[PDB]
Structures are given as C-alpha cells and as structure tokens.
Design a protein around this ligand. Structure first.
Ligand SMILES: CCCCCCCCCCCCCCCCCC(=O)OC[C@H](COP(=O)([O-])OCC(O)COP(=O)([O-])OC[C@@H](COC(=O)CCCCCCCCCCCCCCCCC)OC(=O)CCCCCCCCCCCCCCCCC)OC(=O)CCCCCCCCCCCCCCCCC
Ligand SMILES: CCCCCCCCCCCCCCCCCC(=O)OC[C@H](COP(=O)([O-])OCC(O)COP(=O)([O-])OC[C@@H](COC(=O)CCCCCCCCCCCCCCCCC)OC(=O)CCCCCCCCCCCCCCCCC)OC(=O)CCCCCCCCCCCCCCCCC
Ligand SMILES: CCCCCCCCCCCCCCCCCC(=O)OC[C@H](COP(=O)([O-])OCC[N+](C)(C)C)OC(=O)CCCCCCCCCCCCCCCCC
Ligand SMILES: CCCCCCCCCCCCCCCCCC(=O)OC[C@H](COP(=O)(O)OCCN)OC(=O)CCCCCCCCCCCCCCCCC
Ligand SMILES: CCCCCCCCCCCCCCCCCC(=O)OC[C@H](COP(=O)(O)OCCN)OC(=O)CCCCCCCCCCCCCCCCC
Ligand SMILES: CCCCCCCCCCCCCCCCCC(=O)OC[C@H](COP(=O)(O)OCCN)OC(=O)CCCCCCCCCCCCCCCCC
Ligand SMILES: CCCCCCCCCCCCCCCCCC(=O)OC[C@H](COP(=O)(O)OCCN)OC(=O)CCCCCCCCCCCCCCCCC
Ligand code: HEC
Ligand code: HEM
Ligand code: HEM
Ligand code: HEM
Lengths: 51, 98, 379, 74, 239, 65, 32, 56, 54, 54
C-alpha cells in the first residue's frame, strides 16, 4: 500500500536483504541436500561420489 | 441530475426501510471503532438503539411501516466528521512512519 | 458452591462454545449450514467407518467387496447410499456455506476464512480419493485423468504423478494408499473444524445486516440448539429422500461396471461437485495453465478479504453487488453444466466465457462495483 | 466475549412474554403470506434475471449441440 | 453418430411407492435361465437370493440342484462336480473371459448383476435393446456376424437376436410373446441390480410419514422457544 | 401366436409424426440408393422415426401385457 | 418516570384462554 | 380440559415425562409399523411375495 | 463381535477398521488428559506442592 | 489389504518388496512394545509418587 515505500522502509529493506538472501541460500542448499538434486550436486567436488 | 440516481440508490439500498441512518451500516474496522468510541453520549445511544431495532426487525423479517423510513433528505451523517478526523490522524501517523 | 457447567474444565469449553455463546439474534437460516456441515461430517465419519468394516481395498476384490456390502450385509445398502449421498449433501452445504460467506461479508474474519479454505481443500481431496475406492469404470478413469493432471507441473511433474500412483499407472498401490488417506483425512478435517470454531468464537458471528450485534446477542442454547436441530431435520429429510427414493440420481451409472483399464468410458466426467472445477481446467488450452486455473479457482477465496472495497461489510444494502453475486452463482451453475457436457463446438466457447466471467466477476466487477457503491452513497 | 462486556447501552426497555402465554403460530397465514410476498417482490428483480439467462444459455447450448450432430447435406 | 434415448416405459415399479411385480421376477428368472444364461452371468447373485422374492425354499433347492458346480479338492487333490445348493452363485457360462470373447465373435457378454444399474436408461434401455432389432437402413453395411440394433451405442451389436417369439414355455401359462419375455426379463434384471428395491420403498414410506409427523412438531417447538423473541417489544426512553 | 408389440407398432405408426418420419426416411432411401459411391446413411432418419414410434409405443403396449 | 412505563398490549400474540381480566392463569396454566 | 389432567398426571415430573415417552415409544412403534406396512401392502397389492406365496 | 460364528473374513476387516479409528480417539483422550493435568500442575517426586520452585 | 486371502501375503509384501517397507513394519511391531513399556512405567510412576490424587 501507500503506507509502504517512502524513505524509512527502504533502509529497512537494505539492512534485511543480507539476512534474507542468506536465508534464501540456506533454503536452496537445504532443498538440494534433502532432495539429493543431481543437477546442482554433480559439480560439488566431494559429494559427486554419491553418483 | 445526479441526485436523482443518488436518491434512487438510497431507496434501493433498503437500510432506510429498517429505520437506519447511513452511518449505521458502516463496517466496524479499527478506525471506525475508534470513531464510534469518540461519539458523544446522546448520538451513541441513539445509534445503538437504532441498530437494535434494525436487528430486531431482521430477526422477524419485517420492515418499519412506510412512514417511519429515514428519508434521504433527513439522513444526518453523524459519524462522518469523527471518522474523517480519525482517518486523518491515522494518515498523519503513517506519514510520520515513512 | 458453583455450577459444574461453568467450573468443570471440559464443561467450561462446552458451555462457552455451545451453551452460553452470545450469538446474534437475527441470523437467518443461512447460518444453520455451519451446523449441518458438522453433522454431515459426523455422519460421513460414522457411515464410512461402518463401510470400512466390510470393504477390502484391493484391485481384485474392492468392487466385489462393495457389491457384497450392498447385497449381502444386513442393511449394507442403507449405509452405502447414505455415505454417497451424504457426501453429495456435504458438498451442497459446503457450497452454500461459502456462498453465505461471500454474500454477507464474513471473510472479514480472516483467520476463520483461511481455515475454511483449508477445510474446503481437504474436503475436496477427501471426496476425490473416496470416489476411487469402489474401483468402478468412472472411479478408475477419473482417478487416472485427475492424477495425470499433475504431469503438467514443470520438471518434477512426472516424478510426482508416478509417486502418487505408487507405480506406473493407477493400480493396486494407488487403491490401497487412497483408502488409507481416505481414512486418515476426515479426522484432520475434524481438527481443522475445531480450529475453525475456535477462531470464530473470539469474534462472535456476523449477522446478515453486517453491523456489530453486540447490543443484541442472545444465549445460544435455548434458541439456536432447536434452530439447528430443525435444520438438521430438514437436511436429513433431503438426504433420506435421496437415499430411499432415487439413490443413484447424483451418480454415474457406469460406476457399476468393474474397472477395465482397456476400455475408456465414452464419458469421463468426475463427480457432480467437481465439474465446476473441471470445466475451468478444460477452458485453458495449456496443460499447466489448466492446472493453475484449476487450483486458482479455489484459491481465489483467499483473496476476497483483500478485494473488499465497499464500506459496508454485508451485501443486503448493496443492490448492484447482489446482482453480481447472483451472476456469479449462475456462472458457477453454468460451469457445472459445461463440465458435465462433452468438450465440443457449442460447449468450448461457453466454458471459456463462463470461466473468464467467473474470474472477472470475482476480481474486477465486484470491487469496481463496490467503488461505485460507495460513490453513490456519498462516502 | 461472554455476557457482561458485550457493549454499553442505556435507556433501552425490553418487554417479553412467557412462551407459555403466547401462541407459537400467531397469524401464521394471515400475516405470513403478505410478508413472504413482499420479500419475494423485493428480491425477485435481483436474483431471477441471471438464472433466466442461464436457462436461455442451457437451452441454446443443447439445441446447438444436437443440431451440430445432425447431417450436413453434401 | 446420434443416440436413441429409450422411451420411459410405464413400468409397474416406477411410482415412488410401487414395488416390483414378483411374479414378473419369477418369470424373468426362468427367461434368464433358459435363454440368457447360455452366454451371460450374474456371478454376484446366488440361488439363495431367490428365496422369498421369486421362489420358495424348496423350489430354490430344486433350482440349485439342477446344475453342476465345481467344488474344492478331494482327498486326492482333484476337482469334482457336485450338484449346487443355496450357496453357489449362478454358474459362469465361460470359465474365463477369454473363452467368452472367443466363442461369441470377439465381444464379451457383460455380467448382468448390474446391467440395469450400469446402463444409461435402466430397464427402458434393455427392453428397447431386446425389442428393437430391425433390418439396417440403406447405406449401412454391417460385417457378417454383427446385428443392427439402434439403441446399442454404435448401432452394431455382436448379439444374435436373444428372444424371438415363443422362445420358452412359461410355467405360469402366460403366452411367451417376445414383448412379455422382454418385460419379465427386464423386471428380473432390475431386481438383480437392486435387490433392496421393495424394502427401500418401504423404508421411504416410513421415512415420509415420520418426517410429516416430526417436521411440523419440531417447527412448533422452534416457534415455541423463539416466541419470546418474536413478540419482544422494545422501547427507547432517553432523558 | 401374434405379438402384442407388433400390433401396437402397426397401429402406432399411423401417428402423423411417424408419417412425416417415414416420408423423410423414404426420401433418404431413394437419395442414398440412387447415389452409387456415396457415404451418407439413412441411420438418423430412421432414428427420428424410431424415436417418435417408440415414444408412442411406450405410451401403449404395457397395458396389453 | 418509572410510573410511565406501561407494558404494550400483547393481545395479538396472547394464547386463547389467557385473554381477559379473569384470572385464567392459574386454572388454565395446566392446560397451556 | 383433558390436557390439564395430562399435565398434572404424566407431565409435571420430568422422570414421569420420560416414562410416558418410553411407553409411548413402544405403542407408537407398534402402531406405526402396522399402519405403514398395511398401507404399503395395500398400495402394491398382488405384487409382493407375501401376496403370492400361497400358490407354491 | 465375530461378525458370524468364528474369527473369519468379517472379523479381520472389522478389526482393521477399529484399529485404524481407535488411535485418534486415544489422541483426543490424551489431549483431554493434558488439559486436566494442566488445571492442577504436575506433582514432584517429593509429593509436596512446589508452587514456590516452579 | 484386509482380506483373509491377502492379509499375510500383503504383510510379506510390505516386508520383502516395498522399498524400505520392512523398516516401517518392524518399527510398528516393536514401537508397540515401546509404547507399552512406557505405559507401564508411567502407571508405575503415577502409583509410586501418589499422582493418582489428580
Ligand atoms: C412464494 C414464492 C417463492 C418464495 C421463495 C423463493 C424466493 O425467491 O424467495 C425470496 C424471499 C426473499 O428472501 P428474504 O426473505 O429477504 O431472505 C431470506 C433469508 O435470507 C433466508 O430464509 P429465512 O431464514 O428468512 O427463512 C427460511 C427459508 C429459506 O431457507 C433457506 O434458505 C435454507 C434452506 C435451503 C434453501 C431453501 C430450500 C427449500 O425457508 C423457506 O423459505 C422454506 C423452507 C425451506 C426449508 C427450511 C429452511 O425469501 C423467501 O421467500 C424465503 C426464503 C427463500 C426460500 C427459497
Ligand atoms: C441443505 C439441505 C436443505 C436445507 C435444510 C434447511 C436449512 C435451514 C433450516 C432453517 C430452520 O431451521 O428454519 C428456517 C426458518 C426459520 O424461520 P421460521 O421459524 O419459519 O419463522 C418465520 C420467519 O421468522 C420468517 O417469518 P415471515 O416474516 O415469513 O412470516 C412468518 C411465516 C409465515 O409465512 C409462511 O408460513 C409462508 C407461507 C406458506 C406456509 O414465515 C415462514 O413460515 C417462512 C418459512 C417458510 C414457511 O423456518 C422455515 O424455513 C420453515 C420451514 C417450513 C415449516 C416447517 C416444515 C413444515
Ligand atoms: C442428529 C441429527 C438429527 C437431529 C434432529 C432430529 C432429532 C432430534 C429432534 C428433536 C430434538 C428436540 C427434542 C428432544 C427431546 C427433548 O429433550 O426436548 C427438550 C425438552 C425440554 O424440556 P421440556 O420443558 O419440554 O420438558 C421438561 C419439563 N416438564 C417436566 C415440566 C415437562 O427436554 C425434556 O423434556 C427433558 C426430558 C427428555 C427425556 C428424553 C429421553 C426419554 C426417553 C428415555 C428412554
Ligand atoms: C519439490 C520437492 C521434491 C519432490 C519433487 C521432486 C522429487 C525428485 O525427483 O527428487 C529427485 C530429483 C533428483 O535430481 P534429478 O531429477 O535426477 O536431476 C536431473 C534431472 N534431469 O530431485 C530433483 O530433481 C530436484 C527436486 C527439488 C527441486 C525442484 C525444483
Ligand atoms: C436461489 C436463492 C435462494 C432463494 C431466495 C432468494 C434469495 O436468495 O434472495 C436473496 C437473499 C435475501 O436475503 P437479504 O439479506 O434480505 O437480501 C437483501 C435484501 N435487500 O439473500 C441471500 O440468499 C443471501 C445468501 C446468498 C448465498 C447463499 C445461498 C446461495 C449459495 C449458492 C452457492
Ligand atoms: C439421530 C437419530 C435419527 C434422528 C432423525 C433423523 C433421521 C430420520 C428419521 C425419520 C425417518 C426414518 C424413520 C424410520 O425409522 O423409518 C423406518 C426405517 C426402518 O423401517 P423397516 O426396515 O420397515 O423396519 C421397521 C421395523 N424396525 O428406519 C429408517 O428409515 C431409519 C432412518 C434411516 C437411517 C439413517 C438414520 C440417521 C443416521 C444414523 C443415526 C444413528 C447413528 C448410530 C451409530 C451407531 C451406534 C451403534
Ligand atoms: C528403577 C530401579 C531403581 C529404583 O527404583 O531405585 C529406587 C529409586 C528411589 O527413588 P526416590 O524418589 O529417591 O525414592 C525415595 C528414596 N528415599 O527410584 C525409584 O523409586 C523410582 C522407581 C519407582 C517409581 C517409578 C515407577 C517405576 C515402575 C517400574 C515397574 C513398572 C511396572 C509395574 C508398575 C505398574
Ligand atoms: C448366445 C449368446 C447370447 C444370448 C442368448 C444373449 N446374449 Fe446378451 N450379449 C451377448 C454378446 C456376445 C454381447 C456383446 C455385444 C457387444 O458388447 O457388442 C451381449 C450384450 C448384452 C448387453 C449389453 C448392452 C449394452 O450395450 O450394455 C445386455 C444388456 C444383454 N446382452 C442382455 C441379454 C438378455 C436380457 C438376454 C436374454 C433374455 C441376452 N442378453 C441373450 C450374447 C448373448
Ligand atoms: C470427509 C467426509 C467423507 C467424504 C466426503 C467421503 C466421500 C466418499 C465418497 C464420495 C465415496 C464413494 C461412495 C461410492 O461411490 O459409493 C466414499 C467411499 C468410501 N468412504 Fe468415504 N467419505 C468421507 C468419510 C469417510 C470416512 C471417515 C471413512 C472411514 C471411516 C470413509 C470410508 C469410505 C469407504 C470405505 C468407502 C468405500 C465404500 C464406498 O464406496 O461407499 N469415508 N467416500
Ligand atoms: C469442514 C467444513 C466446515 C465446517 C464444519 C464449518 C463449520 C463452521 C461453523 C459451525 C460455523 C458457525 C456457524 C455459521 O456461522 O454458519 C462456521 C462459520 C464460518 N465458516 Fe465455516 N465450516 C466449514 C467450512 C468452511 C468454509 C469452506 C469456509 C469458507 C472458506 C468457511 C468459512 C466460515 C466463515 C467465514 C464463518 C463465519 C460465518 C459467520 O459467522 O458469519 N467455513 N463454520
Ligand atoms: C495414552 C497414553 C498416555 C499419554 C500420552 C499420557 C500423557 C501424559 C503426559 C504427557 C503427562 C505429563 C508427563 C508426566 O507427568 O508423565 C501425563 C501425566 C500423567 N498421566 Fe498420563 N498419559 C498416558 C497414559 C496414562 C495412564 C495409563 C495413566 C494412569 C492411569 C496416566 C496418568 C497420568 C498421571 C497421574 C499424570 C500426572 C503425573 C504427575 O503429576 O506426576 N497416564 N500424561
């Protein structure tokens, strides 16, 4: 809504992008590991031995 | 004129048939709830009794007699100033928030 | 010293939820359905359990088990057709409940609304899986089509459908796991119904006028207990009329043929309460588009509290909104009929227009109309 | 939410009579029928038209269908 | 393409509370036994079911004992025939569906336990199918061995004319005209698909009378309890 | 042995609906037979005729049985 | 002002027997 | 009026009310079963097995 | 309970249905049990009220 | 399944053919014993420390 945007909320976004992006990376790696996603995991040195 | 369609819609809405004023049908959100809290005692009591009469009528599926209908020209907007002030204050708080 | 009704822990909950609950004194008959659904749920939990005591989920003996239920068990037919037509009545009451929510602006109770959407999804899932157990022609082929629907999901789709099937095609494993999921799910529905009631009771209820009835509440027990008993009696009248006079009125006759996977039935329509959804799927040419529209048809109920723009919670004081609501109901009926009919020249275009109109009314027509509503009322 | 903190009300008097002193069906037909007629008149111009349109669409679709299944002379 | 819709015949068991003509059921069972049972089956129906609906107990015993059914292994592990009893379902004309398909051209004669409840139309469809055979109209040439029946979807059935005139001899003495045979067999097949038909209608009658007695009374109770609120008169007395 | 169904049929084809049904049918037979290598068939003209005649017969017949 | 509080007439909804200045509420209580 | 006597006799006590309900259950069940069965056999006279068993 | 004259086909399916339904009744009763226990609080090994050391 | 002609065979099917099905089967069979061990110890605890006052 119009309550969002504005000056203040943009700095909040700036301070929370690092943590949110790293949480997204956490989720991506968790999905890859749990589902044993071949596509991503055929290029990581050690665990290529699974297949 | 446009008032013709406005009056037609006022009659078609049917809340006047229950002896209700326009602002009596307002959905009670947060700003509106604060608005009713802000109301003076006499207006609040009148509004409460009017709503009780409307609920009583709808329970029996009956409407007020023809003559006791809130005429479109006599629908005082008692809540409108208080609700406008509450919304303006909320807008001020939101603007200070950004 | 003290009343047990309001001092005993369990009795305190029962009192505050069914006895002394302040309910609006002007709620119309449309509010009875919340009771009936629950009662229907109980009935579905009940008769189905008695169906579980003579039904053996297996490909070579599921249909023979059902026909033995209806032909050799004492009064087996009563329980079986009670269950089928009670599921149909359950969906009738569910649709009427959602219609009441849409009309009288009950979606401002967001927690209860979303829990209701979850319950709706769970009930459609439960009924779909339940229709598979008889292992008839329509059972087998409808299950095949609806599960193949998930193949449209990108990347993981084929793996998903082969996981659901438990193999390569609808077969023994699918039947058994469908029976197990069919047993488990209604208890999840019951827990979600308890959560639904818990969320509702904190905000009271919505009377038809849409105004706060805090000045008019009446005790639940003396009045709405007998009101809901009368409503349940009416629903039992309808259900027993269906069971004892035209049992298979709302059913495909071809389901009384053992599932032969080598013969596609001329018609593969799902149950009557799914066609409104199914027609939507047949509207979009794209497969993934079809599945997405299928899911979104149900999911659009979540967006309603965000799409409400009129300053009046209810609809009884908004005539042009009533016209659009009844247009939407007529559109739903048209979608059901279209899903029933084959996908040919006079029906493809009608289904496309019906689906477009349904989405457009929910998303576009109603909010703009409510804006015009507020403008007309000088607020 | 229980009775006691529902709202604040003043100067409202309610008269009620015992259910054993009244008749459960007072003017059931004399007063009920005009009320039902008025209620039907109020809404019939807002609920009927879409269903009439649906019936027209139903009939048109059915006639178009089995007209399509008929021969085309050639 | 196109499809005949079977006209709604005035069956005796058509009214809301009209049971089945059990004499017609008795005759239809004989019609099945002597004509239809050569290539169809109602595996879900056993001779026991006939007791009390179309045949008496001793008659059902006699009917069962007229046929020979496979039994379990002997003390030597072989299969042996034995006369049936009131616990053996109606014998399958063909041991396996492949034999049935091979013998009757290439079509499987459907099992008739549910053939009325599985066909769109019910008794009307089957009656019209049996009494609807006709010479194909010009421009349609059926391959030898197929027979033109308009009501059958595709208008080309693999079915020899099942019932001609005076096929069998009804024990009652009723003339065995084709129409009578078809009516009796259709009623019997309706009983086969819905054995609870009579009791269903009976319970429906009791249900109707109970609701007609209860719904007014429960409505009266509702009015009784709510009449406090319906007659409630309010008043506003502000200072 | 005469079949009541046949008698009801013969007495029943005289309805004016089945009349024009038979005229359309016969027109179809001449049209199809005259055309040597055609594909059109008289199936649905026969279908209309049978629909009318069979609704008629369904009204009668069972009374005679 | 409390003396001006007069119950509105309920003769429209009142039940047959109890419709008069005669007592009709003790002897007819059992009937209703 | 008789209804007053009914109330004073069988209806005032809740437990006597329940006893009246219970005995009424017996007699109403029997009477209603007789009546409904008779009505059905009258409607479909000559078609039920009960009406045709005699000739076998 | 046997659904007949001995433990047979009927009893097996009947027990299957009952074994399926019952644990959810057990769960409901366990919830009620936790409710009742929470209305008073747990008991310590010493057997004495421990409202001070909570 | 729940038929007497396919009960034992279906259990052996779960044990031998279903992928990791034997883990679930024996986990159920011995989790029943674990459940009852915990149940008996729970009843003993309630008895010993006088928790039956609740
Ligand atoms: C006479 C001409 C036909 C009149 C009815 C059709 C119509 O359009 O009426 C509109 C007319 C106008 O509606 P309204 O009085 O402003 O509001 C009706 C209430 O919202 C909701 O209704 P209500 O609570 O005021 O009164 C209950 C009503 C309606 O009951 C229900 O809607 C619930 C039952 C399911 C739908 C009806 C099934 C029959 O029941 C009936 O009308 C008949 C009994 C139905 C079964 C028991 C309930 O309503 C009626 O005449 C009765 C209600 C609709 C019945 C259908
Ligand atoms: C899904 C399954 C199907 C649906 C199942 C039912 C669900 C909803 C059940 C609702 C419920 O328990 O009562 C609804 C609703 C509640 O209102 P009510 O207790 O009738 O009181 C009248 C209203 O205040 C409205 O009063 P009024 O202003 O119309 O005048 C009094 C009265 C007079 O009007 C009439 O009686 C209509 C004229 C024909 C009689 O109105 C009615 O009786 C309207 C109901 C239709 C009769 O009652 C009905 O719909 C009555 C059903 C028919 C009578 C009982 C069976 C005989
Ligand atoms: C479930 C789905 C369907 C639901 C609807 C259909 C089934 C219920 C319909 C009727 C419900 C209301 C009436 C039930 C009886 C009842 O308790 O009424 C309230 C009434 C309310 O009380 P009352 O005021 O009517 O009567 C008691 C007061 N005296 C004694 C002065 C008459 O309850 C009773 O009367 C209490 C006694 C009930 C006894 C019941 C058991 C008797 C048989 C035992 C064996
Ligand atoms: C979504 C949650 C997981 C369930 C669906 C997918 C299940 C699945 O297939 O898991 C195994 C699979 C292994 O990866 P694989 O498909 O072999 O990768 C090469 C493909 N050409 O897994 C995958 O392919 C990745 C699945 C997770 C990511 C989906 C986006
Ligand atoms: C067919 C519909 C039922 C027959 C009766 C006609 C009808 O429904 O009228 C609308 C009805 C009237 O209720 P009311 O709140 O008085 O409406 C505003 C009046 N100015 O208002 C309603 O019925 C409101 C509830 C409508 C949604 C529930 C029923 C339809 C569900 C369809 C799915
Ligand atoms: C709650 C109890 C019911 C409340 C009222 C709603 C149900 C409708 C009642 C009114 C219609 C039916 C009345 C009735 O009893 O009709 C007679 C019929 C049996 O008739 P018949 O086979 O001739 O036998 C007569 C001699 N016993 O019997 C029937 O038709 C019975 C009604 C149909 C069956 C469904 C009944 C409702 C659902 C089950 C409720 C009870 C659940 C019990 C659970 C298991 C307990 C161990
Ligand atoms: C376990 C074996 C060891 C054991 O029990 O040692 C005794 C010890 C003492 O515990 P404490 O609370 O210190 O007793 C008071 C000491 N003055 O610990 C106890 O006394 C605790 C063991 C008793 C209370 C817990 C319940 C144990 C039940 C075991 C058998 C279950 C089946 C039979 C009962 C049903
Ligand atoms: C000697 C063989 C034979 C006799 C006698 C026979 N049938 Fe059939 N019947 C068949 C075969 C073969 C089919 C398969 C036709 C097809 O599927 O195209 C068939 C098909 C049917 C169908 C299927 C209709 C449909 O479209 O679902 C019904 C119903 C039927 N028969 C009933 C009967 C009745 C009733 C009788 C006698 C009273 C009878 N039959 C006598 C061999 C027979
Ligand atoms: C959420 C409520 C329920 C719904 C909507 C539902 C729906 C259905 C439907 C539509 C059928 C098909 C009936 C038929 O085609 O003849 C069915 C079958 C079945 N249901 Fe349910 N059911 C419900 C609850 C239950 C429960 C709780 C059980 C288990 C206790 C159960 C057990 C069965 C069984 C065993 C069958 C197969 C027998 C049959 O087809 O009738 N159902 N269900
Ligand atoms: C499992 C099926 C369901 C059951 C058992 C159930 C149960 C109930 C009950 C008993 C009530 C109170 C009675 C009433 O107000 O009508 C209620 C209210 C409500 N339910 Fe449901 N419900 C179900 C499904 C749904 C669905 C699908 C929705 C919509 C998404 C929904 C949304 C609501 C809303 C909004 C209310 C408040 C109505 C009001 O007070 O105005 N429920 N529910
Ligand atoms: C279904 C199995 C059961 C579950 C899930 C269950 C659950 C629980 C839980 C979680 C507690 C709190 C933890 C504890 O104090 O141990 C508890 C307490 C208790 N349970 Fe159970 N319980 C079960 C069976 C039983 C049985 C069989 C009894 C004895 C008849 C019992 C009597 C108690 C008592 C007395 C307490 C309070 C213990 C104390 O205050 O010291 N429970 N229950």
């Amino acid at each position: 809504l119009s309550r969002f945007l504005g000056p203040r909320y943009r700095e909040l976004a700036r301070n929370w992008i690092p943590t949110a992006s790293m949480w997204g990376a956490v989720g991506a790696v968790g999905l890859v590991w749990a589902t044993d996603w071949r596509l991503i995991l055929d290029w990581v040195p050690y665990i290529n031995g699974k297949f | 004129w446009l008032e013709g369609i406005r009056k037609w819609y006022y009659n078609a809405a049917g809340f006047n048939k229950l002896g209700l004023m326009r602002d009596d049908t307002i959905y009670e959100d947060d700003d509106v709830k604060e608005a009713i809290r802000r109301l003076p005692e006499n207006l609040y009591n009148d509004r409460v009794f009017r709503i009780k009469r409307a609920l009583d009528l709808t329970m029996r599926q009956q409407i007020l007699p023809k003559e006791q209908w809130t005429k479109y020209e006599e629908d005082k907007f008692y809540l409108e100033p208080y609700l406008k002030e509450v919304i303006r204050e909320r807008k001020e708080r939101e603007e200070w928030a950004k | 010293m003290t009343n047990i009704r309001k001092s005993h822990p369990l009795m305190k909950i029962i009192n505050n939820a069914f006895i002394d609950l302040p309910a609006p004194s002007n709620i119309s008959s449309w509010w009875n359905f919340g009771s009936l659904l629950g009662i229907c749920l109980i009935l579905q939990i009940l008769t189905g359990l008695f169906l579980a005591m003579h039904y053996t989920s297996d490909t070579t003996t599921a249909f023979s088990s059902v026909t033995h239920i209806c032909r050799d068990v004492n009064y087996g037919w009563v329980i079986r057709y009670l269950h089928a037509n009670g599921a149909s009545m359950f969906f009738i009451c569910l649709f009427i409940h959602v219609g009441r929510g849409l009309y009288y602006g009950s979606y401002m109770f967001l927690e209860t609304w979303n829990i209701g959407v979850v319950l709706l999804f769970t009930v459609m899932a439960t009924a779909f899986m339940g229709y598979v157990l008889p292992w008839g022609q329509m059972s087998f082929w409808g299950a095949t089509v609806i599960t193949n629907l998930l193949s449209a999901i990108p990347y993981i789709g084929t793996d998903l459908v082969e996981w659901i099937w438990g193999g390569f095609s609808v077969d023994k494993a699918t039947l058994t796991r469908f029976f197990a999921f069919h047993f488990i799910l209604p208890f999840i529905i019951t827990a979600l119904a308890a959560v639904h009631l818990l969320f509702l009771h904190e905000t009271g209820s919505n009377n038809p006028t849409g105004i706060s009835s805090d000045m008019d509440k009446i005790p639940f027990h003396p009045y709405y207990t007998i009101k809901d008993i009368l409503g349940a009696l009416f629903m039992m009248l309808i259900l027993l009329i269906l069971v004892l006079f035209s049992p298979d009125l709302l059913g495909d006759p071809d389901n009384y043929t053992p599932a032969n996977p080598l013969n596609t039935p001329p018609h593969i329509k799902p149950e009557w309460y799914f066609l409104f959804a199914y027609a939507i799927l047949r509207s979009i040419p794209n497969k993934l588009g079809g599945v997405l529209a299928l899911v979104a048809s149900i999911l659009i109920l979540i967006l309603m509290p965000m799409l409400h723009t009129s300053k009046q919670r209810s609809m009884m004081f908004r005539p042009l909104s009533q016209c659009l609501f009844w247009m939407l109901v007529a559109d739903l009926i048209t979608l059901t009929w279209i899903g029933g009919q084959p996908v040919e020249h006079p029906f493809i275009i009608i289904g496309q227009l019906a689906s477009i109109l349904y989405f457009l009314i929910i998303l576009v027509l109603m909010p703009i109309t409510s804006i015009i509503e507020n403008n007309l009322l000088k607020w | 939410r229980e009775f006691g903190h529902l709202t604040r009300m003043r100067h409202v008097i309610t008269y009620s009579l015992s259910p054993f002193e009244q008749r459960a069906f007072p003017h059931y037909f004399t007063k009920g029928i005009p009320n039902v007629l008025r209620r039907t008149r109020a809404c019939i111009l807002r609920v009927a038209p879409p269903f009439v349109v649906f019936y027209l669409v139903y009939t048109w679709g059915t006639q178009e269908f089995e007209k399509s299944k008929r021969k085309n002379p050639a | 393409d196109l499809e005949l819709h079977a006209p709604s015949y005035p069956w005796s068991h058509r009214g809301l509370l009209s049971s089945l003509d059990h004499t017609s059921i008795r005759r239809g069972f004989q019609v099945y036994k002597q004509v239809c049972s050569s290539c169809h089956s109602m595996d879900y129906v056993a001779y026991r079911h006939l007791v009390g609906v179309c045949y008496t107990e001793e008659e059902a015993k006699a009917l069962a004992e007229e046929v020979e059914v496979q039994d379990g292994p002997n003390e030597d592990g072989e299969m042996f025939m034995r006369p049936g009893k009131l616990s053996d379902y109606f014998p399958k004309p063909y041991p396996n569906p492949e034999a049935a398909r091979a013998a009757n051209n290439g079509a499987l004669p459907p099992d008739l336990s549910y053939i009325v409840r599985a066909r769109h139309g019910g008794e009307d469809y089957v009656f019209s199918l049996l009494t609807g055979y006709c010479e194909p109209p010009t421009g349609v040439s059926l391959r030898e061995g197929l027979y033109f029946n308009p009501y059958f979807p595709g208008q080309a059935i693999a079915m020899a004319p099942p019932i001609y005139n005076e096929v069998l001899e009804f024990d009652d003495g009723t003339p065995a005209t084709m129409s009578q045979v078809a009516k009796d067999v259709c009623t019997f097949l309706r009983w086969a698909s819905e054995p609870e038909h009579d009791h269903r209608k009976r319970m429906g009658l009791k249900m109707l009378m109970m609701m007609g007695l209860l719904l007014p009374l429960v409505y009266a109770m509702k009015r009784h309890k709510w009449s406090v609120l319906k007659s409630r008169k309010l008043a506003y007395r502000p200072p | 042995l005469v079949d009541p169904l046949t008698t009801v049929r013969e007495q029943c084809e005289q309805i004016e609906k089945c009349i024009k049904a038979r005229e359309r049918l016969e027109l179809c037979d001449q049209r199809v037979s005259s055309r040597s290598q055609t594909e059109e068939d008289c199936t649905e003209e026969l279908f209309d005729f049978l629909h009318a005649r069979d609704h008629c017969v369904a009204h009668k017949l069972f009374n005679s049985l | 002002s409390h003396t001006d509080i007069r119950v509105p007439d309920f003769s429209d909804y009142r039940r047959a027997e109890v419709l008069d200045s005669t007592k009709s509420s003790k002897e007819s209580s059992d009937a209703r | 009026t008789l209804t007053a006597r009914l109330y004073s006799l069988l209806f005032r006590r809740t437990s006597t009310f329940a006893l009246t309900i219970a005995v009424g259950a017996l007699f109403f069940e029997r009477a209603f079963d007789q009546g409904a069965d008779a009505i059905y056999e009258h409607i479909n006279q000559g078609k039920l097995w009960k009406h045709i068993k005699h000739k076998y």
